[PDB]
Paper text:
Among BacNavs, NavAb, cloned from Arcobacter butzleri, is the most critical contributor, since its full-length structure of Nav at atomic resolution was first resolved. Our crystal structures of NavAb mutants show that the mutations increasing the hydrophilicity of the inner vestibule of the pore domain enable a divalent cation to stack on the ion pathway.
The amine group of the mutated L176Q side chain forms two weak hydrogen bonds with the main chain of Val173 and Met174 of the P1 helix. These interactions make the carbonyl group of the L176Q side chain face the centre of the ion pathway. Hydrophilic side-chain mutations provide hydrogen bonds to molecules around the SiteIN of the selective filter, allowing calcium ions to stack at SiteCEN, the centre of the ion permeation pathway.
Author numbering:
A (entry chain A), B (entry chain A), C (entry chain A), D (entry chain A): 999 to 1090, 1097 to 1226
Write the structure that this text describes.
């Protein structure tokens, strides 16, 4: 177009994205201030007005970005994320989910965008080890629920409660004073279940970490 | 044979192993559903029937696999594991040990098989460090049992209880509020035993991890 | 100058810096002894006299060092640190902040100076990951304060209290028995907030550590 | 000598060191059995006799080893350790220190000897970082003792008690529920002291570990 060139030369301009970055920061501090009961009584209307007069800017700039790249928008992870976080912020739990638009700042800022996509690119390698661990949790979740579910309903009564207690034991939070030692007052051989479980879960996780270290180092040694 | 070629051309076919994989998954979800008291009252007979009509399939397919490879079966770690997990599932604790046949899914799936055998191949290097640690635990288990066994019978009364408390201190779970600090109310110099113990156990474990990192990296730098 | 050469040939002499090192050590042991109520009653005056007759030496040697390097002093991180730790020790919380002049010993000793500046040079790389984590804490601090702030005021009532509880959960100290499990007595789905939070925070920190390992190894592989 | 060749050809023979290894193992199991009150009542005399008839063998074989290498013995770390652990076991706390002669098995066994000396060779590099950490603990031990020593005498009353509580906070055992959170009921800004302390102590330790990883990898990349 005649003006289509102008609008794609503003949408891809530095100052338009710098402006929506200042708005993300201002909204983030606004969102931060909205936890204060005293501030909300004193200036609640300026902030809620502000929150409206900023959600409108964000929605119009989503409209513009969609126009300049009609289908390129809906195949791009970052702009897709923007689409969804402005969608959440537009409906009349959702209240809390609205804060996620502050990750909008990870999208705009390129250095942050680089770090995030680096972290994502790590994941494909871990898929194989995660699958063994999820299967491993599934198997020991079922064993623990059938062994301790009656006498210890709060911790091992349900499969979900046993995926919870086992995750806590793997994080090694009160694994012994909190869970195993109380269990051994009724069932005196519970260590056979947990100390092996601990050992396996640690080993795998260690290897997971070492795996991440050689997949990173390969591109350097070449 | 005439049909022996047919049976070895089905046993090594893709679809026969895909079929026993679907059966492992169906049995795994069945086993998962058997923790629900409500589901077991409503559909317990369909599932127990299912569990029988699947343990039979698994046993016949073990029979077939043994026939096609008569001695190759009993020298192969994965099929040996299958032999034993279908054996456990065939006897009239065992109830819980039956769930282990879900690791049958690690055997069938090749990508999982790769990850598991990678994890195994790590272990030979750790044998030397594990032996020093097991000897180290043995020595400090005996010291702790003789020092605190009377006044603190629940934690250090027996060698096994002291291999337990020392493992908890090495995992650093309530090492200080839970065990050392109570001990210092009777025996005020217990830190000499534990803080050195902590230090040694951490150092060795750190080296263990670093060891795993150079044994992995060697095949890349070549 | 005529004597300016003499004073710059003492200020940069080995024995002048060896002397102020002995004074740092003597003051450090003095500072160590000043916690003892009994020693302070018995020899408090010798030590406070000593503390004065040493703060004067340190101040004159700051004066000398400033003279020999007039502007080189105020552009040098180590001597700048000396300026500020002798300033703190000169005013008529400050009492406790005075102990920081024992890090004066890191400045004088060159091997220590090397280690410290190595540790500093690591930091620039972590700036990108720290910024994502600080933003991530900010977002989940706000979510946690709005979700649990009323029913759990002590832990999540304020943004600062939620940056505190979330840091404790990331350190994995009583994350489950101490915070999540009590929360699930009122709000039974709190794991959705924390177990994801845990996962993200661990992953990032792991990568942070792996990052530090490849930035160190690069100068070796070249 | 005429027989001196014979005795140095037995002392350095495989079977003499294999024999004292069997004696270390037999004594280790004996020492293990001596925790059992029931076994000591039933067979206490056979074991104490055994313990004497083995401490004598060990002492004569120390005598022989000293003779074959008169001064080479007292300049060799492993045999020096043997000298001292047979000395401890010869005097008429010492009772518990006697168990250390089971590390005699690390000395005899060469693969174990290799692992141990590898672990030792790591340490020289950590000396610089350990010195910064020990100075760092000293400084924050003094700060914590002067800030919280009166209101919290059990944890921070003495410098030793503050080197204890700070070590526990660095191990991250009940750092927050156990120590900081109780402190903030009297002194509401204690996080300024501990969360910075935590951060520094973690960072340094991380670098310590990364250091160990590049000092190991250097001999491989060459
Ligand atoms: C990225 C990280 C940057 C740094 C983040 C800084 C976070 C600091 C938060 C700590 C503030 C809370 C401390 C405090 O005491 O403030 C009180 C209020 C809540 O208490 P309040 O509601 O005032 O008490 C009511 C009493 N009543 C019921 C009897 C009437 O609580 C507040 O006033 C909250 C104050 C809002 C702080 C917002 C700071 C935003 C930093 C900029 C980050 C932008 C990133 C895009
Ligand atoms: C930390 C704050 C998070 C905030 C919420 C985020 C929500 C999603 C936002 C997505 C924005 C980032 C997307 C992204 O960076 O993708 C790029 C990555 C890395 O690229 P990379 O792998 O380097 O590309 C090389 C491959 N090539 C050349 C053939 C194209 O390419 C890949 O994706 C590799 C494939 C692995 C994908 C695994 C992703 C899912 C893990 C977490 C799922 C959470 C669900 C709730
Ligand atoms: C590829 C990207 C990376 C993703 C990797 C993470 C995989 C996530 C695993 C979770 C999959 C299974 C989820 C699940 O089973 O949820 C069950 C429970 C819910 O408890 P629930 O029974 O609903 O409580 C209700 C109480 N009631 C009925 C009395 C009112 O909720 C829980 O307990 C979940 C606790 C977390 C357990 C994590 C277990 C496997 C993690 C493997 C980690 C891999 C790296 C090592
Ligand atoms: C590999 C990991 C994949 C993802 C795993 C998903 C795990 C999800 C488990 C969480 C389900 C439990 C939550 C829940 O509230 O369910 C209730 C039942 C047990 O309570 P219920 O017996 O219904 O209560 C009785 C009350 N009474 C005594 C008064 C009559 O508990 C149940 O109903 C259990 C529901 C069965 C879930 C099975 C999911 C299998 C996922 C597929 C994995 C296949 C791997 C090969
Ligand atoms: C090569 C493949 C890797 C394998 C490495 C793992 C080595 C496993 C070490 C276990 C060896 C010794 C086993 C043992 O001594 O068992 C004793 C206790 C049993 O307690 P017990 O006294 O039966 O309780 C009965 C209570 N009663 C009589 C009043 C009714 O049970 C326990 O306390 C065991 C607790 C675990 C302690 C682990 C100690 C050494 C681990 C070294 C780890 C190496 C990597 C760092
Ligand atoms: C770099 C690290 C080097 C090694 C650091 C060594 C730290 C050792 C500290 C442990 C000392 C405390 C143990 C102890 O029981 O001493 C008691 C005094 C405090 O109790 P006290 O005030 O005597 O009790 C009064 C009783 N009342 C109220 C009824 C009259 O507490 C004291 O007497 C404190 C003793 C001062 C020890 C100063 C050691 C400095 C080591 C040199 C480091 C120089 C680095 C530049
Ligand atoms: C580039 C060099 C490295 C630096 C990296 C570290 C970044 C430090 C993050 C701290 C920034 C935000 C500070 C902040 O928000 O302070 C709030 C609270 C204070 O609590 P407050 O509400 O004042 O308590 C008063 C109680 N009252 C009113 C009732 C009397 O105090 C806290 O809760 C702070 C707790 C620490 C939280 C740390 C959170 C982000 C850390 C990211 C770590 C990066 C590496 C993974
Ligand atoms: C290197 C690691 C190898 C594997 C280490 C194996 C450790 C196993 C230790 C667990 C044994 C303790 C379990 C148990 O219930 O035994 C009971 C006794 C102590 O109770 P007891 O004194 O029998 O009870 C008296 C009751 N009363 C007062 C009313 C009369 O406690 C005992 O009977 C202790 C049994 C001695 C076990 C010695 C095993 C040595 C393994 C070989 C290692 C050699 C390395 C050089
Ligand atoms: C784990 C069970 C322990 C049981 C108690 C042990 C008590 C002491 C037993 C001593 C036996 C081992 C002695 C030893 O292996 O020394 C050899 C190490 C490693 O040799 P390496 O550095 O490879 O030699 C190369 C240097 N070269 C070619 C120029 C000679 O050469 C070095 O020593 C390097 C120098 C660093 C020494 C740091 C040692 C002290 C750390 C722990 C102190 C604890 C005191 C209670
Ligand atoms: C080169 C080979 C590696 C060696 C590195 C390890 C360095 C060891 C540091 C210990 C140096 C200072 C020792 C010290 O100050 O001892 C004080 C306390 C003793 O408490 P105390 O006051 O005697 O309790 C008596 C109670 N009473 C009077 C009421 C009856 O005892 C404690 O609290 C000690 C707790 C351990 C603290 C460790 C602090 C610095 C560790 C730096 C670690 C470096 C790697 C990161
Ligand atoms: C990109 C990533 C790793 C790439 C790599 O490091 N090397 C591969 C290239 C050489 C890819 C390549 C192959 C992928 C696995 C399998 O396909 C399917 C498999 C099925 C299991 O039930 C659970 C998922 C499994 C383990 C997958 C995980 C992950 O998705 C892998 C490892
Ligand atoms: C394959 C594995 C490591 C291979 C490697 O990294 N380098 C070896 C090849 C060069 C092998 C090679 C040598 C093996 C040790 C000894 O034989 C026996 C020894 C007796 C002890 O009391 C306890 C077990 C010990 C430590 C064994 C551990 C482990 O089984 C080792 C390290
Ligand atoms: C020296 C350090 C890393 C050097 C490196 O490893 N490679 C860079 C050279 C190739 C430098 C180079 C680029 C720097 C970042 C950006 O400039 C600004 C950015 C803004 C964010 O909102 C928060 C800070 C960010 C992430 C900075 C972090 C840090 O300060 C970086 C990574
Ligand atoms: C062998 C070990 C490291 C070897 C290395 O990695 N590179 C050195 C060779 C190149 C050696 C070489 C130099 C040694 C330090 C200093 O001499 C004294 C110094 C005084 C402090 O107050 C406290 C101890 C310090 C930090 C020592 C630590 C350690 O003893 C070091 C690092
Ligand atoms: Na804990
Ligand atoms: Na912990």
């Amino acid at each position: 177009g005649s003006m289509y060139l102008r609008i794609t030369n503003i949408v891809e301009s530095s100052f338009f994205t710098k402006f929506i970055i200042y708005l993300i920061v201002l909204n983030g501090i606004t969102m931060g201030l909205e936890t204060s009961k005293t501030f909300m009584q004193s200036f609640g209307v300026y902030t809620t007005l502000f929150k409206q007069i900023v959600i409108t800017i964000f929605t119009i700039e989503i409209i513009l970005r969609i126009y300049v790249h009609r289908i390129s928008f809906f195949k791009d992870p970052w702009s897709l994320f923007d689409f969804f976080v402005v969608a959440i912020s537009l409906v009349p739990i959702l209240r809390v989910l609205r804060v996620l638009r502050l990750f909008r700042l990870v999208t705009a800022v390129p250095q942050m965008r680089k770090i995030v996509s680096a972290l994502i690119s790590v994941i494909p390698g871990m898929l194989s080890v995660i699958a063994l661990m999820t299967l491993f949790f599934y198997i020991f979740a079922i064993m623990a629920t059938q062994l301790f579910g009656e006498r210890f309903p709060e911790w091992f009564g349900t499969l979900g409660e046993s995926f919870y207690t086992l995750f806590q034991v793997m994080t090694q939070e009160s694994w012994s004073m909190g869970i195993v030692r109380p269990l051994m007052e009724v069932y005196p051989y519970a260590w056979v279940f947990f100390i092996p479980f601990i050992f396996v879960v640690t080993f795998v996780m260690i290897n997971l970490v070492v795996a991440i270290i050689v997949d990173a180092m390969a591109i350097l040694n070449q």
